[PDB]
Design a protein around this ligand. Structure first.
Ligand code: A1A7Q
Lengths: 933, 114
């Protein structure tokens, strides 16, 4: 099934030659199997597919013979030329043809210059036939599967058009339907136009269509030997853009502004006719840039020549000059001296002297820019002082050709973002670009040498800023090729600064250590961003296919959850579900990400409802309740060391610590209080059995609150002796009302039992007993008449009841309800709402661990909700503050799985900081985009 | 309306609501069923009179508390059966995957009812 294509202009093949040889036609021609394709005479653009056999007539003359020039050049974007019948001399006619065609090169090498004699019968056909055979000859499992599917390495051999529907003939067959204008389903037409649009058919139907003055206009002439097939049909499509309409198949003069003529249209010639104004200069610049991008991106073609038109006086009609000579005349000087003793370049070829730059950017070299000292070197980038500020200049010494500079500033003048590096003073006289300095410089140089300054907030800011900039790039439909720590420039090391990092591409598919595995869409950029973020989090550990193990495992970096998740989510083996950078920014923009210092998962099906930390290197003790006996677990935060021991008869209800400048006091449902050695772990003993279960311990000296209100006092020295006795036991309420919460606050202990609050001093007798059920007038009975489980206080008692969203505010002096917080009302904005734990820190915020898994947290100064953080864990049980050793608040919840999340203590501060920061960035970006353009 | 009238439990309030109202047909800002609101606030006659006009025993709320769930949770021996006899009885499910047997004396009643 070797690929053979008959290349005819008028399709002389399908006229009379098919049966002799035996819309796009496909048929099999065995000898060896050959799959012949036929082309047609209504061709516009199909040369993507490009054996060969050139077919042409001679009898009409020589204009038709000199017509396959685009035909041969499409091959490189084995050829044999055959004439037609010739019976209706001929060799003499071909003699000029053969001499011209075979001479020199530029076209692909002709294998043979042959001719055929008539259609009825040809002896030269046999001579032709073996010429096809000799040059035609000079995995199996897919081939069998390929044969199977049509019944129901082959793809490049013509068997398959990858994946395609049925035979590849149909795609060319239905494409012929597009060429001419059978019955086809409407359900799949939406997909077909997408494939049709990929061949420039859509918008435009390319096959459907079939007051100038000398001084005021600039004429740009392109001579080229040929117009390649599809060149014009694509050029028409790409010049339907907009920038501050009648057309031919050869010529698309989009007038737009009546004063901004653009008569682009057709060795063959291409002419651009534009007026002498700023808009004409800019539009000429854009058209030249687009055409040069075409010819430098797909097909080269000394090759073409560039013309520039000028006229000193209008009597002479457009004396023309090559562009190179004029480029030298513009590099040195600016005018055109007349033959007799004039006109500047800016009126002849504006794009040479960058006359179409926005007026906000000109190298106003008036003793302002200073450079070229050896100390100013920053690769061919120097340090300069532009406008009394220090900047970085990059000069174009060699082979600039004014293509690197133009293609650099036509993208740099159209990107104004706080995280995208900005352009100042694009200049010609030394041909340089002047760039804002990176005061602290490239990121990589900081990661390798200045690891001291990498605060967690600064790392998150760098990643946030790069993600912001790269999101904007992807929004502008620009693929940012190569994203590394080398190309991230840090200006400041001050975490709350608005501008900390920008992205800047230093030109010199991606470096061999930072590219996506496929190296190519935005998704390769996202993989590159994931590598960047891994580099930031690791702080250059890997810097000094792909399988990247966990950063914590090797480098010992501080674990930063919900960023290892983002690294793993971006850095995927396939681009299909890795996140878009429209949402990578959204993920990185979250104080939960900033401050969630740690998260730990306990062994499966373990229920813990009470927990204590260690006061000095970090440890936690949990009271497990999955089995209805005593179960106490030891957890280690730095090195996971969960070890569970079976101690005491019944489930442990609450723990507390007593220190010996130690002892852990576990309170069990049977009522016994059991003391364990904290360090040695051998010396262990119980204490006085209590009448009912114990509920709360300490929060102060060894206060003990049972389930009948019978609150006892235990001194720090008493626990040293087995079976201790209370200094005093005071009864606070009946047996049916358990005493649940005791709190430290100005040295008075507060508490709540049943539905009554109380407080007591070092005398250890209650000095106030606040009555709370009567508050049922506010809220209602099902909530107000429940127990009280937690109280906190700094200026008023913040009491939480059992299974009640309302958290109540009780003034200490007036002894009267003055506030109530409808937790469900806060939760309506963004799933239980009943409070289950409640913890107050300093005077900034109180955190409310609602039963639905939401740590809904308030600024207690103004009774304002700051954030409604969601743990992802279904419910939350306990919230308490630990010193660690950095202040954290550590939270425990149920999913059954129990999750312990250690949070950096200042979520509210970080929420305000990031929100203000994002507002600053947003207004800065809007103002930058408004003012720059 | 019925939510507040189902806390103190006046005969007159529920009787006036009996003539006209939105019985077993409302959700407050919290989403509680006023019927089983009245049930766990700790009444009998309010619950039964609101049963003879509503006849609902299974209705969820924001947290998934069907009446049987938190009736078993609150340890009410008789009102759970009162909702069992009238309005019929069907078991249900909350959002955490908890059955009234675990929340609950009531468990034995659950086995014979189910
Ligand atoms: C063909 C093409 C190429 C690029 C883009 N291109 N695309 C973009 C965006 C899409 C990101 C907007 C930006 C750009 N151009 C640039 O980035 N130029 C640029 C060149 C040389 C130096 C700087 C620079 C400014 N200040 C600095 N300070 C320090 Cl310390 N070092 C610096 N350099 C030296 C060492 O480190 C890297 C950089 C610098 C800036 C387009 C086309």
């Amino acid at each position: 099934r070797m690929k053979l294509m008959i290349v005819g202009n008028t399709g002389s093949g399908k006229t009379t030659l098919l049966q002799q040889l035996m819309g796009i036609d496909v048929k099999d021609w065995p000898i060896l199997v050959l799959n012949v394709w036929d082309f047609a005479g209504r061709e516009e653009f199909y040369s993507t597919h490009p054996l060969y056999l050139a077919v042409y007539d001679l009898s009409k003359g020589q204009a038709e013979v000199d017509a396959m020039k685009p035909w041969l050049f499409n091959i490189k974007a084995p050829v044999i030329l055959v004439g037609t019948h010739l019976d209706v001399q001929r060799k003499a006619c071909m003699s000029k043809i053969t001499k011209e065609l075979l001479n020199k090169r530029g076209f692909p090498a002709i294998r043979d210059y042959h001719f055929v004699n008539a259609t009825e019968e040809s002896d030269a056909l046999a001579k032709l036939r073996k010429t096809i055979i000799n040059e035609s000859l000079n995995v199996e499992l897919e081939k069998i599967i390929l044969s199977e599917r049509k019944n129901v390495f082959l793809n490049e051999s013509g068997v398959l058009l990858d994946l395609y529907f049925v035979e590849p003939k149909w795609l060319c067959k239905i494409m012929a339907q597009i060429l001419t204008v059978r019955k086809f389903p409407k359900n799949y037409m939406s997909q077909y136009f997408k494939l049709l649009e990929k061949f420039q058919i859509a918008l435009l139907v390319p096959s459907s269509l079939s007051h100038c003055e000398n001084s005021e206009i600039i004429i740009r002439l392109y001579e080229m030997p040929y117009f390649p097939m599809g060149f014009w049909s694509r050029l028409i499509n790409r010049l339907l853009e907009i920038s501050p309409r009648m057309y031919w198949r050869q010529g698309i003069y989009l007038n737009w502004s009546p004063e901004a003529y653009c008569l682009v249209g057709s060795e063959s010639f291409l002419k651009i006719t534009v007026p002498s104004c700023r808009k004409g200069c800019i539009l000429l610049g854009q058209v030249v840039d687009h055409i040069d991008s075409l010819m430098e991106e797909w097909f080269p073609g000394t090759l073409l020549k560039k013309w520039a038109l000028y006229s000193f006086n209008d009597g002479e009609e457009h004396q023309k000059i090559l562009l190179d000579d004029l480029m030298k005349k513009a590099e040195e000087g600016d005018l055109l001296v007349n033959p007799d003793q004039t006109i500047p370049i800016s009126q002849i070829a504006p794009d040479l002297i960058l006359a179409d730059l926005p007026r906000n950017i000109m190298l106003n070299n008036d003793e302002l820019e200073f450079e070229q000292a050896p100390e100013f070197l920053l690769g061919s980038v120097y340090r300069a002082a532009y406008e009394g500020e220090e900047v970085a200049v990059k000069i174009f010494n060699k082979h600039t050709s004014l293509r690197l500079l133009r293609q650099e500033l036509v993208v740099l003048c159209h990107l104004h973002h706080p995280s995208l590096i900005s352009l100042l003073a694009a200049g010609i006289r030394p041909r340089m670009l002047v760039m804002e300095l990176a005061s602290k410089g490239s990121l990589d140089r900081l990661l390798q040498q200045d690891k001291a300054s990498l605060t967690r907030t600064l790392q998150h800011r760098i990643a946030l800023h790069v993600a912001d900039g790269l999101r904007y790039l992807h929004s502008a439909m620009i693929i940012y090729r190569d994203l590394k720590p080398h190309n991230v420039l840090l200006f400041t090391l001050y975490p709350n600064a608005a501008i900390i990092a920008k992205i800047a591409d230093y030109g010199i598919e991606g470096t061999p250590g930072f590219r996506a595995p496929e190296v190519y869409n935005q998704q390769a950029d996202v993989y590159s961003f994931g590598l960047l973020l891994y580099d930031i989090l690791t702080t250059g550990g890997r810097i000094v296919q792909g399988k990247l193990p966990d950063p914590v495992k090797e480098y010992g970096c501080a674990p930063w959850p919900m960023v290892e998740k983002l690294i793993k989510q971006c850095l995927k083996e396939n681009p299909q579900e890795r996140p878009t950078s429209a949402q990578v920014f959204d993920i990185l923009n979250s104080a939960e990400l900033v401050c969630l210092t740690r998260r730990i998962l306990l062994p499966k099906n373990v229920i813990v409802e009470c927990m204590v930390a260690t006061h000095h290197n970090a440890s936690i003790w949990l009271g497990c309740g999955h089995t209805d006996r005593g179960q106490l677990s030891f957890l280690d935060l730095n090195t996971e060391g969960y070890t569970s021991e079976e101690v005491a008869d019944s489930r442990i209800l609450c723990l507390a610590l007593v220190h010996l400048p130690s002892w852990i006091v576990s309170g069990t449902q049977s009522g016994t209080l059991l003391v364990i050695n904290t360090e040695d772990g051998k010396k262990r003993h119980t204490l006085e059995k209590m009448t009912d279960s114990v509920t709360c311990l300490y929060c102060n000296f060894l206060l003990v609150g049972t389930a009948d209100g019978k609150l006892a006092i235990f001194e720090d020295k008493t626990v040293k002796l087995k079976g201790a006795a209370p200094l005093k036991i005071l009864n606070i309420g009946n047996v049916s009302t358990p005493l649940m919460c005791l709190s430290e606050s100005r040295n008075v202990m507060w508490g709540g039992c049943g539905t009554k609050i109380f407080s007591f001093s070092n005398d250890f007798t209650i000095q106030k007993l606040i009555e709370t059920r009567t508050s049922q007038l506010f809220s209602y009975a099902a909530f107000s008449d429940s127990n009280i489980i937690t109280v906190v206080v700094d200026t008023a008692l913040y009491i939480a009841k059992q299974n009640s969203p309302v958290v109540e505010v009780w003034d200490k002096k007036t002894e009267k309800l003055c506030g109530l917080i409808d937790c469900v009302h806060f939760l309506r904005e963004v799933y239980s709402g009943r409070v289950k734990t409640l913890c107050l820190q300093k005077n900034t915020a109180l955190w409310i661990g609602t039963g639905g898994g939401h740590i809904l947290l308030l600024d207690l100064s103004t009774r304002r909700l700051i954030r409604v953080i969601y743990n992802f864990c279904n419910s939350v049980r306990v919230m308490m503050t630990a010193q660690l050793g950095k202040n954290v608040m550590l939270v425990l919840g149920y999913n059954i799985q129990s999750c312990l999340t250690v949070w950096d203590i200042n979520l509210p501060h970080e929420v305000q900081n990031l929100e203000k920061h994002i507002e600053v960035r947003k207004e800065l970006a809007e103002k930058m985009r408004r003012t720059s353009v | 309306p019925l939510h507040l009238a189902a806390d103190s439990g006046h005969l007159e309030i529920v009787e006036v609501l009996l003539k006209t109202g939105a019985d077993v047909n409302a959700w407050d800002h919290y989403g509680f069923t006023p019927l089983h609101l009245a049930a766990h606030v700790g009444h009998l006659e309010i619950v039964e009179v609101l049963l003879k006009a509503g006849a609902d025993v299974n209705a969820q709320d924001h947290a998934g508390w069907t009446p049987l769930h938190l009736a078993a949770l609150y340890g009410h021996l008789e009102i759970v059966e009162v909702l069992l006899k009238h309005g019929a009885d069907v078991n249900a499910q909350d959002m955490w995957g908890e059955t009234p047997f675990d929340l609950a004396d009531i468990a034995e009643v659950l086995q014979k009812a189910a």
